[PDB]
Amino acid sequence: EVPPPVYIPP
Amino acid sequence: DRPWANDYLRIQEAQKFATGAGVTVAVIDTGVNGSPRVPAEPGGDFVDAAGNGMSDCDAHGTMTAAIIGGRPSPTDGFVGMAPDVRLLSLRQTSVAGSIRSLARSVVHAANLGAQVINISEAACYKVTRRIDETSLGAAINYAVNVKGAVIVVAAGNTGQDCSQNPPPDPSVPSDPRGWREVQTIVSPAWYDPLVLTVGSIGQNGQPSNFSMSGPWVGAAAPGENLTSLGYDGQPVNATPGEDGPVPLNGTSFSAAYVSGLAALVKQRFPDLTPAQIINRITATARHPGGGVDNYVGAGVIDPVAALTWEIPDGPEK
């Protein structure tokens, strides 16, 4: 299983 | 505040007219890690006989499901197209043949009462190759013409397995969709207009360079630099990569917006057939020159127009 999706702050 | 797609598609305005309540959307994808904001229900695993669709090991289906139906939150600007739908997760594909499993999962999603079915799978073949998918064709016929499911599928992304189709040749009046130029057949993409096949556009409203073109492309939707919800139901906008974060791009996310629209159209006009929902979506799209082309089909979807314009109903079939 691939690593989880993430959030990159603007 | 809002993901660019939400503003571009006027999602908040659209949701004044419908939210998808009473509609069930099946997500035929890599499975879903469910959460309060992405409350998918098990629709089966067709990759591993154990398991039920509620496990996403590919960081994909989860985000597809959230685009269609992710619930809003008071602390961020993300919401799916239709935040009131029921969501069914059928795991049919996983990186962590599949055309056989596709037919089964299509029938199964219809039998589970899905009225909208989103398919991320896009299998590419050489145009020269002999293609045998009678049972997929049968599955789709059943689901659509018998069960009354609207089916929305990804155009497909260019890659290793999948080479871009050249545009039609303008000098052959009787081949306006350029069949004679096709090199790569995409499936279930080539079932359009029976299903609706969706290409991707960027923020500039132009076709994404990775979006597979073809005589079967029916519509288009945002598919680049997107925001969606993760394994916890929280905003995510990238997957981690070798040389950095990779944005969320893919014709399957484009398809996901259209599945969401279909569910809105369904709630608002509950007597329309799949063909009439499809027609309402394509007739109100922002048409390219010529009205139709291989890259965006009938053009970029317009949810507000789709929900409010009065148009002659097409044939029911």
Short summary:
The complex is a heterodimer of chains A (10) and B (317). Chain A is mostly loops and 10 residues long.
Please explain how this structure is put together.
Chain A: Belongs to the peptidase S8 family. Chain A: May play a dual role in regulation of ESX-1 secretion and virulence. Acts as a protease that cleaves EspB. Chain A: It is found in: Cell membrane. The complex is a heterodimer of chains A (10) and B (317). Chain A has no helix or strand. Chain A has 10 residues and is low in regular secondary structure. The termini of chain A are far apart. Chain B is of the alpha/beta class and 317 residues long. Chain B has a single domain, classed as 3-Layer(aba) Sandwich (Rossmann fold), CATH 3.40.50. Chain B has a 7-stranded parallel beta sheet with strand order 2-3-1-4-6-8-9, with helices on both faces. In chain B, strands 5-7 form a two-stranded antiparallel ribbon. The chains are: A little secondary structure (10), B alpha/beta (317). The interface between A and B is medium-sized, with 8 and 19 residues.
Topology of helices and strands:
The complex is a heterodimer of chains A (10) and B (317).
Chain A: no helix or strand
Chain B: H1 4-8, H2 11-15, E1 24-29, E2 41-45, H3 61-69, E3 86-91, H4 98-111, E4 116-119, E5 123-126, H5 134-146, E6 150-154, E7 184-187, E8 196-201, E9 219-222, E10 228-229, E11 235-236, E12 238-241, E13 244-247, H6 251-268, H7 274-283, H8 303-308
Parallel strand pairs in B: 1-3, 1-4, 2-3, 4-6, 6-8, 8-9
Antiparallel strand pairs in B: 5-7, 10-11, 12-13
Helix pairs in contact in B: 3-6, 4-5, 6-7
